[PDB]
Design a protein around this nucleic acid. Sequence first.
DNA 1: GAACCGGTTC
DNA 2: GAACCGGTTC
DNA 3: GAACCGGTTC
DNA 4: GAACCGGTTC
Lengths: 198, 198, 198, 198
Amino acid sequence: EFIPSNTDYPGPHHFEVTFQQSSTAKSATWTYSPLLKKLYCQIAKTCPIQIKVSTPPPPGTAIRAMPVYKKAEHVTDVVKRCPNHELGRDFNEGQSAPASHLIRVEGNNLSQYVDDPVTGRQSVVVPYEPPQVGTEFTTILYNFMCNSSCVGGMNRRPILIIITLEMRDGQVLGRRSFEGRICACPGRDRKADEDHYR
Amino acid sequence: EFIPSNTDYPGPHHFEVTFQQSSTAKSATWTYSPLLKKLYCQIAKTCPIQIKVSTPPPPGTAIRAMPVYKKAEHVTDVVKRCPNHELGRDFNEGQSAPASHLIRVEGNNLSQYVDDPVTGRQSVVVPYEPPQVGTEFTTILYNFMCNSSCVGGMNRRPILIIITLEMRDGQVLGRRSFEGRICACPGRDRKADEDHYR
Amino acid sequence: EFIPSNTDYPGPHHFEVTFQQSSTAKSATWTYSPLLKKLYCQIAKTCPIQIKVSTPPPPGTAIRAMPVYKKAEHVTDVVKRCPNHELGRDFNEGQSAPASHLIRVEGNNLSQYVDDPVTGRQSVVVPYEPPQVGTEFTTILYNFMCNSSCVGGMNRRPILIIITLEMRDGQVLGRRSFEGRICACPGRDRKADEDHYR
Amino acid sequence: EFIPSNTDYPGPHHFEVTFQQSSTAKSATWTYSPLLKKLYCQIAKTCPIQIKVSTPPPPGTAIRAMPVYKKAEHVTDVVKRCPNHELGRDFNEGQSAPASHLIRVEGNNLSQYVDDPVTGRQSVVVPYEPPQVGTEFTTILYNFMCNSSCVGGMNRRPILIIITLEMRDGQVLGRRSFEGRICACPGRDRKADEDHYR
DNA sequence: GAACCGGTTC
DNA sequence: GAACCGGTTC
DNA sequence: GAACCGGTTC
DNA sequence: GAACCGGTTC
Ligand SMILES: [Zn+2]
Ligand SMILES: [Zn+2]
Ligand SMILES: [Zn+2]
Ligand SMILES: [Zn+2]
C-alpha cells in the first residue's frame, strides 16, 4: 500500500484498456505505441482512454490513475508537478484539481482527487460508469499537466501511469499499466523510440 | 449524460433522417454529402432537414439537435457562438433563442432552447409533429448562426451535429448523426473534400 | 473639433516623428516602411515610437494618439476595438486601461485614455517629457489592441494613426501622421505592399 | 524614472566598468567578450566586476545594479527570478536577500536590495567604497540567480545589466551597460556567439 | 568536452 | 516539419 | 518560413 | 466563379 506495485493484473472481471486509432501524423496531440506500451502525449491536451468490460456490475466501484517513476531511485519521490506550472497561470485558475497534481480528468465532475495523507501518493479516481448505450467503449478523458522532461518534477526520468479498478473499500479487481512520456512532439517521439528498438 | 455519445443508433422505432435534393450548383446555400455524411451550410441560411418515421406514436416526444466537436480536445469546451456574432447586431435582436446558442430552429415556436444547468450543453428540441397530411416528410428548418472557421468558437475545428429522438423523460428512442461544416462556400467545400478523398 | 484633419503639421518646435531601424527580418515584431509612410505591427506587442523636437515645452504640454479611418465612409464610425478583442481574457484582465481602446501605452502611469464624452473619439494622451539626458528622443510604447484584419471593429479598412502634440487647452503645436496596419505577419506584409507600388 | 534609459554614460568622475581577464578556458565559471560587450556567467557562482573612477565621492554615493530586458515587448514585465528558482532550496534558505531578485551581492553586508514599492523594478545598491589602498578598482561580487534559459522568469529573452553610480537622492553620476547571458556553459556559449557575428 | 535530447523558432 | 539551442549525460 | 485555407472582392 | 489575402499550420 505504501509502495505501488507495477505489474499487469487482469483480475477476475477481465479488465482491458484500449485506444481508438490515433493519428499516424506527426501533428497528433497524442499517440500510443502498442509495441512498447508507451503513451506519448502533450501537456494539457485531452488524451482519452477507453476502459472496457464484459462483466461490469460491481457497486460504487472506481478506477484510479496513479503516476509512478519506473526507475528505482525516485520511486520514493512523490510524483508531482514541477515548480513553475503547479504555480503558473495557464491551468491553475480553472480547476479544483490540486495544483500539485500531475493527472487530471476533464469530462468528469464526480472525479475525486486523492492526496494520500499517509503515503502521500496523489491519484485520480472516477466512479465506474457503464458505457453510454450499446458498445465496448467507456471513455475517460485524461489531461497531463506537465512534461516528463520538466525541471523539478520528472526531470527526464520516464514514468508509468497505472490504472487500477477498485471496489469502494480499495481492493483491486483489475489493474493494467503502461509507461507514459509527455513531450512537445509525441508523433516524433513515437517514431524515434521505435527506430532505436528495431 | 455528461459526455455526449456520437454513434448512429436507429433504435426500435426506426429513425431515419434525409435531405431533399440540394443544388449541385456552386451557388447553393446548403448541400449534404452522402459519401462523407457531411453537411455544408452557410451562416444564417435555413437548411432544412427531413426526419421520417413509419411507427410515429409515442407521446409528447421530441427531437434534439446538439452540436459537438469531433476532435477530442475541445469536446470538453461547450460548443457555442464565438464572441463577435453572439454579440453582433444582425441576428441578435430578432429571436428569443439565446445569443450564446449555435443552433436555431426557424419555423417552430414550440421550440425549447436548452442550456443545461448541470452539463452546460446547449441544444434545441422540438416536439415531434407527424408529417403534414400524407407523406414521408417532416421538415425541421435549422439555422446555423456561426462558421466552423470562426475565431472564438469552433476556430476551424470541425463539429458533428447530433439529432436525437427522445421521450419526455429524455430516454433516447432514436438518434442519428453527421459532421457539419459551416463555410462561406458550401458548393466549393463539397467538391473539394470529396476531391481529396477520391 | 468634430472631424479630425488628416494632414501632417510641423510645429513651432518642428514636431517630427521617426522610428528606429527595425529589423528587416520578417521575424521582426514591427517594421515601418519610410517609403510608403505606413507602420506594420503585431497584436499586443510593444511598438515604440520616436518623437523629436527642436525646442521644448511650454509647461504642461501633452502628446495624443488617435486612430482614424482613411476611407471616407467609415470615418464616422468611431474607431474602436472589435467585440472579440474587447471582451477577452488575454489583455483585458491584466490591464487597467479601457478595453474598447485600440491604442494603449506601456510603462507610463500618467497616461490618460480619453474617451470624448461628446464626440466619442478615443485617444491616449501622455504629458510631454523631454528626452532622458543626452538623448535625442523620448520613446513611447504603444500597444495596438486589434488587427486591421479584425471582425466587428476595424474590419479590413486601413487606418491612420494621428499623433498630435497639444497644450493643456487643446490647441495643436505639432502634428504628424502615418497609415497603420496591424497584421499577424509584418515583415512579409511590409514586403508585399512595397513590391506592389512599383 | 518609470522607464529606464539604456545608454552608456561616463560621469564627471569618468565612470568606467571593466572586467579582469577571465580564463578563456571553457571551464571558466564566467567570461566576458570585450568585442560584443556581453557577459556570460553560470548560475549562483560568484561573478565579480571592476569599476574604475577618475575622482572619488561625493560623500554617501552608491552603486546600483538593475537588470532590464533588451526586447521592447518584455521591457514592461518587471524582470525577476523564475518561479522554480524563486521557491527552491539550493539558495533561498541560506540567503537573507529577497528570493525574487535576479541579482545578489556576495560578501557585502550593507547591501540594500531595493524593490521599488512604486515602479516595482528590483535592483541592488551598495555604498561606494574607494578601492583598497593602492589598487585601481573595488570589486563587487554579483550572483545571478536565474539563467537566461529559465522558464517563467527571463525565458530566453536577453538582458542588459545596468550599472549606475548614484548620489543618495538618486541622480545618476555615472553609467555603463552590457547585455547579460547566464547559461550553463559560458566558455562555449561565448565562443559560439563570437563565431556568429562575422 | 563532445555528444546527446528535447523543447522552441522559422 | 525542419533546423536550431542549450542544459545534461557520461 | 513556406505552404495551406477559407473568408472577401472584383 | 475566379483571384486575391492574410492568419495558421507545421
Ligand atoms: Zn512542468
Ligand atoms: Zn462567429
Ligand atoms: Zn478585434
Ligand atoms: Zn529561473
